[PDB]
Amino acid sequence: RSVYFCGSIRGGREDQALYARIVSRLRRYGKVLTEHVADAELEPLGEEAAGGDQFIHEQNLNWLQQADVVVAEVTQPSLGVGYELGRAVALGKPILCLFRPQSGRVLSAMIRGAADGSRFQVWDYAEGEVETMLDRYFEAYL
Amino acid sequence: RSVYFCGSIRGGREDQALYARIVSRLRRYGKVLTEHVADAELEPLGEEAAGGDQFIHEQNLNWLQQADVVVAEVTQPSLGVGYELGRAVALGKPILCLFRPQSGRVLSAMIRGAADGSRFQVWDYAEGEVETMLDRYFEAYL
Numbered sequence: 001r002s003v004y005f006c007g008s009i010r011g012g013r014e015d016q017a018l019y020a021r022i023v024s025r026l027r028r029y030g031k032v033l034t035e036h037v038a039d040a041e042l043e044p045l046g047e048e049a050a051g052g053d054q055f056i057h058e059q060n061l062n063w064l065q066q067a068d069v070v071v072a073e074v075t076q077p078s079l080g081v082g083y084e085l086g087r088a089v090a091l092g093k094p095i096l097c098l099f100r101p102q103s104g105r106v107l108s109a110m111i112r113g114a115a116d117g118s119r120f121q122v123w124d125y126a127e128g129e130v131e132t133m134l135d136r137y138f139e140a141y142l
Numbered sequence: 143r144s145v146y147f148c149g150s151i152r153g154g155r156e157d158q159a160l161y162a163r164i165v166s167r168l169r170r171y172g173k174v175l176t177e178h179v180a181d182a183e184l185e186p187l188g189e190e191a192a193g194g195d196q197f198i199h200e201q202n203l204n205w206l207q208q209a210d211v212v213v214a215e216v217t218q219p220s221l222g223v224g225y226e227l228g229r230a231v232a233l234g235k236p237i238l239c240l241f242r243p244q245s246g247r248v249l250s251a252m253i254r255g256a257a258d259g260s261r262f263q264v265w266d267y268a269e270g271e272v273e274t275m276l277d278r279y280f281e282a283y284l
């Protein structure tokens with residue numbers, strides 16, 4: 001029922017439209033707890049949220065614990081995304097990472113190297129394929 | 143005795159000289175398990191290590207478990223650094239994050255928000271202060 005979606009925010013918003021596409025597809029497979037990550041309206045570098053980073057942190061950890069599945073778009077380097085994956089691994093959550101090699105980047109060894117091909121999966125994709133990728137995973141997931 | 147140092151690699155090498163300064167100072171407080179992170183010679187985007195990301199991942203997790211203290215320079219956004227901090231938090235390691243506001247960046251809410259001011263600390267510093275910062279922490283640490 002519950003999906004935790006991770007994507008870069010203060011690591012930068014370059015991929016925001018992709019996060020929106022990902023979140024949209026995910027809604028047919030479950031409740032997306034993190035949907036705000038995909039919001040085009042959200043741009044930071046303000047410093048707001050009025051509850052502070054502490055509130056953000058605690059609220060997210062609560063959602064991460066509820067999550068049946070964790071999905072991360074790992075193309076844009078982000079401390080927050082890495083942290084969430086680290087916490088998720090320790091919680092024993094099934095995890096799907098999606099990476100775009102077409103970005104010219106090489107994915108982090110700690111992310112790529114964390115993959116077992118089962119409970120932690122990393123999929124390389126081309127931008128137009130992302131729905132199919134999500135479809136494969138979640139159909140298989142049953 | 144044992145310090146795990148985290149710094150960006152595939153997130154980018156901009157701060158490499160700082161990592162070297164940090165690692166150098168840390169050696170008087172203990173064995174630095176991760177010292178290679180500070181190496182100027184290390185530049186990636188190759189894709190090497192010949193043992194693969196899996197080997198890198200497992201070797202680092204072994205070191206992280208041995209570590210008495212985790213120190214991270216969090217100024218440059220990195221998935222790997224975030225991941226290491228996430229794993230370290232779950233292992234209950236004391237943690238010191240160092241951040242430079244002079245970089246113009248705003249630090250990740252998940253990192254800043256993870257801080258309790260005791261077992262997880264985040265210190266803002268100016269580049270010339272980093273030795274003093276490390277000194278404060280480790281003297282206090284006894």
Ligand SMILES: O=P(O)(O)OC[C@H]1O[C@@H](n2cnc3c(-c4ccc5ccccc5c4)ncnc32)[C@H](O)[C@@H]1O
Nearest residue numbers: 006007008009010011048049078079080081250251
């Ligand atoms: O910011 P990053 O790139 O280090 O990490 C992004 C990841 O960490 C989580 N995260 C990071 N910043 C978040 C925020 C956030 C950040 C900055 C803000 C600034 C102004 C107003 C609201 C804000 C909310 N809200 C919710 N989750 C967040 C999030 O789930 C995402 O997956």
Ligand SMILES: O=P(O)(O)OC[C@H]1O[C@@H](n2cnc3c(-c4ccc5ccccc5c4)ncnc32)[C@H](O)[C@@H]1O
Nearest residue numbers: 108109148149150151152153190191220221222223
């Ligand atoms: O690469 P990032 O920025 O996502 O994460 C950097 C963090 O994650 C760890 N880490 C990341 N890449 C690492 C490597 C590594 C990466 C790429 C390489 C390429 C060619 C040859 C050797 C390599 C070694 N070795 C050891 N630790 C690494 C490291 O401890 C550091 O703190």
